Write a protein that binds this ligand. Structure first.
Ligand SMILES: O=C(CCc1nc2ccccc2c(=O)[nH]1)Nc1ccc(C(=O)Nc2cccc3cccnc23)cc1
Ligand SMILES: [Zn+2]
Lengths: 46, 159
């Protein structure tokens, strides 16, 4: 798709099994810059 | 033309990004099926990404969007996870590769919560899991996330 007329992106807030967390979508590559590269592992819980 | 500046963990830049990673973790209500089971991360490396071409490609666009939005770029720091980060950090984000079967269409998706992005490191729903163990809840393999400057401008709320 693209962005709706007059608009520049799409905020959304889908709910999975009751939990709602904010997605953000854009439709032009140049609208985001990848400033930090983060290397990591998920930590195992004791 | 990209280069990676490494941040020391005593650097306050490092500490803010790390804190942002850790503090945005949430308990996804699929029991950890896509991203794994965890509360905290082990943060191995934080690298700043310097590429002037992509930087100016970005700011220039943010100015275009700002004129269209009452002189507000509506900028945000947001996470992004996908199996293509090594491409993205060299060539820049590219809509021509967008997630075509997403909720909100062929777009480039970002997240507030780091753990939410984490769910997409190894594909949609994690799919298979890590390249080496096929374990979507692997604590051995290293993962990678991007922490990006995203220009939202005037954003449409959907669904
Ligand atoms: O943004 C996506 C979809 C997966 C995804 N979904 C989410 C949903 C909610 C919250 C966060 C996320 C999330 O962080 N990720 N996919 C995506 C795929 C590719 C690119 C991208 O810019 N790809 C590329 C950019 C540049 C060069 C590439 C060369 C080869 C392949 N891809 C290239 C951007 C987004
Ligand atoms: Zn693994």
């Amino acid at each position: 798709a693209h962005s709706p007329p007059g608009h520049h992106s799409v905020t959304g807030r889908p709910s999975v099994n009751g939990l709602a967390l904010a997605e953000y979508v854009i439709y032009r590559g140049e609208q985001a810059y990848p400033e930090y590269l983060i290397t990591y592992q998920i930590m195992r819980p004791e | 033309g990209t280069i990676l500046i490494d941040l020391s963990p005593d650097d306050k830049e490092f500490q803010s990004v790390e804190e942002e990673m850790q503090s945005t973790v949430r308990e996804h209500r699929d029991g950890g099926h896509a991203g794994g089971i965890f509360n905290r991360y082990n943060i191995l490396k934080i690298q700043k990404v310097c590429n002037k071409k992509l930087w100016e490609r970005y700011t220039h666009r943010r100015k275009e969007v700002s004129e269209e939005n009452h002189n507000h770029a509506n900028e945000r720091m947001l996470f992004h996870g996908s199996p293509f980060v090594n491409a993205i950090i060299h060539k820049g984000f590219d809509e021509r590769h967008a997630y075509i079967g997403g909720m909100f269409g062929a777009g480039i998706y970002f997240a507030e919560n780091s753990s939410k992005s984490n769910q997409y490191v190894y594909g949609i729903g994690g799919g298979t899991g890590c390249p080496v163990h096929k374990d979507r809840s692997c604590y051995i393999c290293h993962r990678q996330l991007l922490f990006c400057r995203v220009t939202l401008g005037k954003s449409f709320l959907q669904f």
